[model samples]
Target: GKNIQVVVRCRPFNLAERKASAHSIVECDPVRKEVSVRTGGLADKSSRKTYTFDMVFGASTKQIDVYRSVVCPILDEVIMGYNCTIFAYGQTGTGKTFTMEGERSPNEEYTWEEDPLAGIIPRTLHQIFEKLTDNGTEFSVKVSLLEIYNEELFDLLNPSSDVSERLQMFDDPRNKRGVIIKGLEEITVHNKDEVYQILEKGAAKRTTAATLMNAYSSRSHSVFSVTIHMKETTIDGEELVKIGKLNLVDLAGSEAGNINQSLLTLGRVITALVERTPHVPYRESKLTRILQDSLGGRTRTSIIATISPASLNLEETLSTLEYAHRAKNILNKPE
Candidate 1:
């Protein structure tokens, strides 16, 4: 059992932002696991607020650096048979998806696997094959992608299906990855190469729908999960099966409330967990219900919170840091 690991990442200013000749209000100190934000920035008086976390990455932090420091060890735990989740949470335009799914390079210099821009999803998928290949273990890997928009569930990997065809849901109170969505297709990732095609299809689905539904559109949360089943023989040669799961969640824009029904409900449950409140409320929203088993339960969880390093987003940045700092208090031990 451990307190949910909370890491902070701050991205540099966007194009129009730097014309202040503005500078990053956020400063990261990796050795100290600390991040300092100029609380009173260009608009306000000068004051600094420093917070410590399990890990801190600045605008200078590269994609692979985060994977190696954060995701790599967690992936190993999944191989040892644990259900784990990594969530990217923060204010809008903070690169949550960019941090979770990552971007392909502008030039054609590298393949998907080798792309320096490849984020946690691709990097973890690539490593799974590398780690499991011929270690005298017979294993199968499956990948599934599900997205939420308008408080509805869509299977991004469902083959040739209507983009608007939302799916049904289920729950597993007696299970670790307790909440389940029915009719969600799980594609067998036969090899590392198959990972690319899976993501390509899923990405196309999300993009097409966003284009067509512009009038009804809102940003979404995408949960990309990988489940691995392995067979190993003991000394007596009896084969035993082990299963593990990893859920990479990229959340929609969220704050305390308003466009915040589900996010608020989620916040409620998280607070309850930290406060050790009796009867933690999982039924408050579909989001919490679906994520019921992952918080302080058996499933290992981590939150990677991001902030924009600009005075323009100062208040939201502070909100992000406080939210993440509070989340660091949650402790999980499987039942």
Candidate 2:
């Protein structure tokens, strides 16, 4: 059995933070997998609080290190036919995008050899294909990218339809279980390059707008899912088919009112799941409904909560910390 593993990451101070001489109040003790925040200026040492998690990364922590510790383990389970999800959560300009998508090159192709900078998504694609090739696994992979904006689902990979069209969420008729998006495009990917190409295309269609906190703020939650179907033969001449899925979610910043409400609904769902409530309100919001499996079902999950250590955003920072703290305690029995 596996439980949801939650981790926290603090991003380096941005130009605006540096300009205001904002000091980092967040201190991470990797040895203890703990993080502490000291509120107010250097004078207020009494207002400090510490929280523990599965792992904690300071601003100086490298991206490769994060992937190795948090993501690689989940991927290992995914290849064995288990569903997995990794989500980045935080306010705007809090390094969620930087951690998940990373800085794209001018050419748009990812350079996997370049470590400590490339984002988790690209690295995941490279590693997945590499392992498939190394193990000579006979497999087929499909990719689907979707954005939830204003409570509506838009298929980023489907160029034939207008993005404004709200896609309906329906129960899979074939398998009475699990939710499916109507008319969502699932593109077959042959290689890592093809996967990245599809990702770049979907990213281009993501909703973004300039905000006070971030120049290009993501206004919608994006979920990139990769499904793998593999054929394996046993020594006894038995053939087996395995299916696995990996969901990489980049949620909209928590600062926006609407986004925060959706996140709150997600929180409620988590609370219900943790408490083993008879009624888990999975239908509270589109985000929670679509993530029904990931929250309390068979999926192995991980959450990377990015935060700003600067004092200017102390309120939101503390709120994020509390939110992550709550999530870390939600127990999900994963098979």
Candidate 3:
């Protein structure tokens, strides 16, 4: 059960795609957990290439369905003192942000129960609080949000006036905690409302701009992590402290000349880990270095690979499928 789970999600056509009358080139079968991509048209023979995954969600799949199927199990593991990581990977305008952060406007009030479109992050906070309350466990949650832009780490929660003094990655060889960010702000929260507030504030500080593919495209890879410290009573009437971490990563869109190399580095890292090579290149890039634990270390990991089904985005879709397929082979053992 420590295997890395990789799922695929094909988003609905956007306004531009609809306006252009783009045809969907990707077809998914949830029953089989398989996705087939047609090279040309459906009529062409030998054009369809199918790939199997842990799960597959079609264009019409709802947000709630995805959260329940992909994230709920990980949340359960986290509460049991296991570290978990869930990330979305795809090209720009492929709905990576929409899948991770949801389509709800930033100005709107955050309500997980009321918002049918609330994405995994919001839903996760709600579920965590509910579980802790139901179990009557005393727990404290701390959150940290950071972005890797231009190979530099930026503190989304607490940014400085100058860029030089933002944050730095420190490695703890003794504890094997992977890379840790120094001077990063970790805000402690007790309730879901406080969690949402911190998320909104950090999101507003994210690096985004208008792109031809996406109007508000995320230019950097954002990592929003929640660490839970819970106090539990053992059967022997002894008090124990359990620590669990849940990392929700929204990777930057893979595009030519724009953070694509970092994505490639990630692929390389995964390949090395899967092959059990002598050397794993986590230090090749800042993004990969920071995600060392989540990728192939002692963490329960899940990947939601988003893709555009439109004919125009055929190349990007294929690339995403290849990456995701490679990721499916990565195996990890959790302690």
**Better candidate number, 1 or 3, judged by lDDT:** 1
Better of 1 and 3 by TM-score: 1
What's the lDDT for candidate 2? 0.77
lDDT of 1 by residue, 203-320 (tens): 8888877877541223677788899998877686677688988889888775424237776666667666766688677887766677665565565677889899887787888988
lDDT of each: 0.78, 0.77, 0.77
Off by over 4 Å in 2: 41-43, 105-116, 174-177, 207-217, 330-335
Query: Candidate 3: lDDT over CA atoms?
Result: 0.77
Model 3 Cα lDDT, one tens digit per residue, 184-208? 8888877877876777777665533
What's the C-alpha lDDT at position 330 in model 3? 29
Better of 1 and 2 by lDDT: 1
Pairing residues by index, what is the TM-score of model 2? 0.89
Candidate 3: segments with Cα more than 4 A from true spot: 41-46, 105-110, 159-165, 207-217, 234-239, 256-258, 275-278, 329-335
Clashes of 2: 0
